[PDB]
Design a protein around this ligand. Structure first.
Ligand SMILES: N[C@H]1CCCC[C@H]1Nc1cc2nc[nH]c(=O)c2c(Nc2cccc3cc[nH]c23)n1
Length: 262
């Protein structure tokens, strides 16, 4: 699809994953600054599946794909989020206000509400997969594990990011928008913890044991009671009683407007 002659890549890598590297580039559309996933048979199919998901999505809070290019390696060219991953940003900017964190996490809930309405499951929702366009504009990224739900099912049956996964994912291998809501609760905890890793010092098996005991991570320092209450609701054990994204986004929206009033 894209013309390799129209793409100029920077040598430095922004990041990496088993897929390969993420590099900054420029594409001749005006010129568009881009982030490019560069592959490093199954990997090619995985990148094309990621591209196929992104092609179907159109929302202000989800990273846009520009196109694909088959050159020195398969490349997935996407819009650039200049400020990078949310967890890293907050670790480096410890004075971002609680109001600003709520604004950003609410934007992610708006993107996830759209994803749920579209019947896609993200399956890797975590602060490392929320990118900042500006200090006030967040977008969801990294659709490599995402799936388009079948017309007749509300779940996808499957190394996993265990600390972000709901009990039904671990126990029954079933991934739904409600499974993404559980991950969104962990993402909220990460955001209010300024990008600290969740379940510090614990093995995945210890986390599963902790959750089975009805125990949950505590309230981050300075996190508003209302936001902690929402994280706990996202962490409802029984998938059937857990809220969907419409309910989560509404709670965040109303709380953000309350904060804005001051
Ligand atoms: N989850 C991230 C981090 C883990 C590995 C994978 C990596 N993935 C992505 C996917 C992306 N998709 C679309 N646009 C992006 O900009 C982008 C992206 N930018 C990005 C990453 C890291 C640092 C910086 C600094 C500026 N931009 C950065 N990182």
């Amino acid at each position: 699809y894209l013309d390799r002659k129209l793409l100029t890549l920077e040598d430095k890598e922004l990041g990496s994953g088993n897929f390969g590297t993420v590099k900054k580039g420029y594409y001749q559309m005006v010129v568009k600054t881009v982030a490019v996933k560069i592959l490093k048979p199954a990997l090619k199919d995985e990148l094309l599946a990621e591209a196929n998901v992104m092609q179907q999505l159109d929302n202000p809070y989800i990273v846009r794909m520009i196109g694909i290019c088959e050159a020195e390696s398969w490349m997935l060219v996407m819009e650039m989020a200049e400020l990078g991953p949310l967890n890293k940003y907050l670790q480096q900017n410890r004075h971002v206000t609680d109001k600003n964190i709520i604004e950003l996490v609410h934007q992610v809930s708006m993107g996830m509400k759209y994803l749920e309405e579209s019947n896609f499951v993200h399956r890797d929702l975590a602060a490392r997969n929320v990118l900042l366009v500006t200090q006030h504009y967040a977008k969801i990224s990294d659709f490599g594990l995402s799936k388009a739900l079948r017309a007749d099912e509300n779940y996808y049956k499957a190394k996993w990011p265990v600390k972000w996964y709901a009990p039904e994912c671990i126990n029954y291998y079933k991934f739904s928008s409600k499974s993404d809501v559980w991950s969104f609760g962990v993402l909220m905890w990460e955001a209010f913890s300024y990008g600290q890793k969740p379940y510090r010092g614990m093995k995945g098996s210890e986390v599963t044991a902790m959750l089975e005991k009805g125990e949950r991570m505590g309230c981050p320092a300075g996190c508003p009671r209302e936001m902690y209450d929402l994280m706990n609701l996202c962490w409802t054990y029984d998938v059937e009683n857990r809220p969907g994204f419409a309910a989560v986004e509404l709670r965040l929206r109303n709380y953000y407007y309350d904060v804005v009033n001051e």
